[PDB]
Amino acid sequence: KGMTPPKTVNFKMKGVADAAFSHEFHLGMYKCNECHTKLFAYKAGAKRFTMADMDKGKSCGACHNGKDAFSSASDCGKCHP
Numbered sequence: 001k002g003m004t005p006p007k008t009v010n011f012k013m014k015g016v017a018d019a020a021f022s023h024e025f026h027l028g029m030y031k032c033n034e035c036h037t038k039l040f041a042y043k044a045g046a047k048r049f050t051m052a053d054m055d056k057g058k059s060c061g062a063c064h065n066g067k068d069a070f071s072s073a074s075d076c077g078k079c080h081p
């Protein structure tokens, strides 16, 4: 609650399995300001992005571009368990 990062943030959607983001994992390499507010709001579901947006470097795609981290264009299961 509040400004505390949830261990896991879920993204609901139809068709594909919901996506999941782990603060626990990412906090092992990044500080809050490396993602907030430039990439994400300090509020879940405030702004929704698509896989296409990620392909353009937005949302998860800002890092999951095949160079900084595994591409968001593949490995669907990694983020949609």
Ligand code: HEC
Pocket (backbone or CB within 6 Å): 002, 003, 004, 005, 006, 009, 021, 023, 026, 027, 030, 031, 032, 033, 034, 035, 036, 040, 041, 042, 043, 044, 045, 046, 047, 048
């Ligand atoms: C990028 C790798 C992140 C880092 C580093 C941190 N956060 Fe985060 N946070 C991130 C995402 C992808 C999301 C989900 C956004 C969405 O569209 O749903 C979040 C969300 C939060 C929230 C809101 C949670 C909620 O409303 O239930 C908070 C309060 C939050 N994050 C806090 C936070 C803090 C304080 C961090 C440093 C310890 C931190 N996050 C790092 C991505 C990333």
Ligand code: HEC
Pocket (backbone or CB within 6 Å): 011, 013, 015, 016, 019, 020, 047, 048, 049, 050, 051, 052, 059, 060, 064, 071, 072, 073, 074, 075, 076, 077, 078, 079, 080
């Ligand atoms: C983590 C780096 C991801 C990978 C790899 C894939 N997806 Fe994803 N997807 C992810 C998130 C966090 C979200 C929600 C973002 C938000 O702000 O709501 C999504 C969303 C989708 C959606 C809905 C939007 C759209 O593009 O139509 C679908 C249908 C979806 N994702 C499918 C999908 C498939 C099939 C993937 C492999 C080719 C894939 N995603 C990978 C995070 C990540």
Ligand code: HEC
Pocket (backbone or CB within 6 Å): 019, 020, 021, 022, 025, 026, 029, 030, 034, 035, 039, 059, 060, 061, 062, 063, 064, 068, 069, 070, 078, 079
């Ligand atoms: C850069 C600031 C990142 C943002 C924004 C997001 N992720 Fe990430 N993620 C990043 C790195 C450098 C790594 C490690 C290297 C690699 O390629 O794996 C990761 C890893 C993940 C993982 C796997 C975790 C594990 O158990 O090994 C997942 C499933 C993942 N990232 C998902 C994810 C989603 C859904 C994001 C958008 C909401 C997201 N990441 C943003 C760097 C960054």
